[PDB]
Amino acid sequence: GHGSAGTSVTLQLDDGSGRTYQLREGSNIIGRGQDAQFRLPDTGVSRRHLEIRWDGQVALLADLNSTNGTTVNNAPVQEWQLADGDVIRLGHSEIIVRMH
């Protein structure tokens, strides 16, 4: 709703400068494809390389790749739930999660 917002999960992405993308409510699919909602600039990224289901409590982080898969806090996982200040690193793009 508008007026007031709840937990705002902002993905701070090092594109080179440092951009921010806030999670939409629902699942945000990151990768290179038309099958992806958010498209990454570099390559090696699958169509669905990673997806985040954001709901009004926690952000479900799912890594959808094995070889160039994403690490959370530098640890390789398939499934993780986002936390403020966690370090998410994926092929040629690393991102810090900020939860407001």
The domain total for the chain is: 1
Residue range of the domain that includes 96 = 1-100
With 0-12 / 13-18 / 19 or more C-beta atoms within 10 angstroms meaning exposed / middle / buried, residue 18 is: exposed
* CATH number of the domain to which 35 belongs: 2.60.200.20
The residue to which tokens 């099958």 are assigned? 35
Alpha-carbon distances of 50 from 1, 3, 89, 97, rounded to whole Å: 26, 31, 11, 14
